[PDB]
Design brief:
Organism (chain B): Rattus norvegicus
Shape of chain B: flat
Protein name (chain B): 26S proteasome non-ATPase regulatory subunit 8
Radius of gyration of chain B: 22 Å
Distance between the termini of chain B: 47 Å
Number of helices of chain A: 8
Structural class of chain A: mainly alpha
Shape of chain A: flat
Helix content of chain A: 55-70%
Largest sheet of chain B: none
Structural class of chain B: mainly alpha
Largest interface: A-B, 11 and 9 residues
Family (chain B): Belongs to the proteasome subunit S14 family.
Number of strands of chain B: 0
Number of strands of chain A: 0
Order of helices and strands of chain A: HHHHHHHH
Oligomer: part of a larger assembly
Distance between the termini of chain A: 56 Å
Keywords (chain A): Hydrolase, Metal-binding, Metalloprotease, Protease, Proteasome, Zinc
Largest sheet of chain A: none
GO molecular function, one term (chain A): metal-dependent deubiquitinase activity
Order of helices and strands of chain B: HHHHHH
Strand content of chain B: under 5%
């Protein structure tokens, strides 16, 4: 949220002179904070156009994160840890499962507020159980995949 | 059926030579095929073979035929040999010894599993 003002007097707005002076402008209007701001803006010179001088070299600098990605893509943790993750998720999945039975049996309702009370639609077992299978699958794949890759290559 | 079962003793190599119109031609060649089949089954099955043992099972006619068939495969050492036993023992356990065998080539396996879902 940036705006530009040269700032010229009130009369210039009132007459309608101020758009004759601006020519070679597009202009724009936004409202961070209500009618009071709009009025202040109009008195000034309103939003005069901001363009950006940018290109791909500058754009590439901003892109970056970590070259450290080099070590990290290969890294995998201790096997006891692999087991902790798998255990925590299966245990979790048991809790939500009991609601899930109801969900599939019913859910004729399509009205979000009524569904929420009826078949525990809000705190849904479908959303969360799916979300859970998906973390567990991806997590196991990257850890497992790395361990094997490293083995062959280092020796 | 008899071939199918493994019931080699029952198999006719004694019949089909008795009608001589055209049935004999097939049965003579078949005798070589069953003979080979026995040599293979015994190779993986049991560690030794005798000469008292061998004549009857392969359906050899002579002891000379025994000497010939066994050495090819690599058996012959005498009435006592050791092929089978050792290999049968070696297969379970690859938890302390590195491996990738089954579930395909692993490297592909993890990547494929993730594409599908």
């Amino acid at each position: 949220v940036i705006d530009a003002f040269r700032l010229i007097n009130a009369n210039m707005m009132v007459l309608g002179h101020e758009p004759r002076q601006t020519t070679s402008n597009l202009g724009h209007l936004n409202k961070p904070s209500i009618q009071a701001l709009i009025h202040g803006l109009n008195r000034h010179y309103y939003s005069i156009t901001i363009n950006y001088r940018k290109n791909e070299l500058e754009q590439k600098m901003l892109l970056n994160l970590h070259k450290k990605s080099w070590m990290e893509g290969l890294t995998l943790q201790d096997y006891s840890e692999h087991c902790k993750h798998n255990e925590s998720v299966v245990k979790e999945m048991l809790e939500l499962a009991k609601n899930y039975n109801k969900a599939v049996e019913e859910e004729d309702k399509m009205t979000p507020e009524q569904l929420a009370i009826k078949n525990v639609g809000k705190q849904d077992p479908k959303r969360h159980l799916e979300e859970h299978v998906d973390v567990l699958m991806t997590s196991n794949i990257v850890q497992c995949l790395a361990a094997m890759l490293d083995t062959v290559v280092f020796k | 059926q008899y071939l199918m079962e493994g019931s080699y003793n029952k198999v006719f190599l004694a019949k089909g030579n008795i009608p001589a119109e055209s049935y004999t031609f097939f049965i003579d060649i078949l005798l070589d095929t069953i003979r080979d089949e026995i040599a293979g089954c015994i190779e993986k099955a049991y560690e030794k073979i005798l000469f008292a043992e061998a004549t009857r099972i392969l359906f050899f006619s002579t002891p000379k035929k025994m000497t010939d068939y066994a050495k090819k495969r690599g058996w012959l050492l005498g009435p006592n040999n050791y092929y089978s036993f050792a290999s049968q023992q070696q297969k379970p356990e690859d938890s302390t010894i590195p491996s990738t065998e089954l579930a395909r080539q692993v490297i592909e396996y993890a990547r494929q599993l993730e594409m599908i879902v």
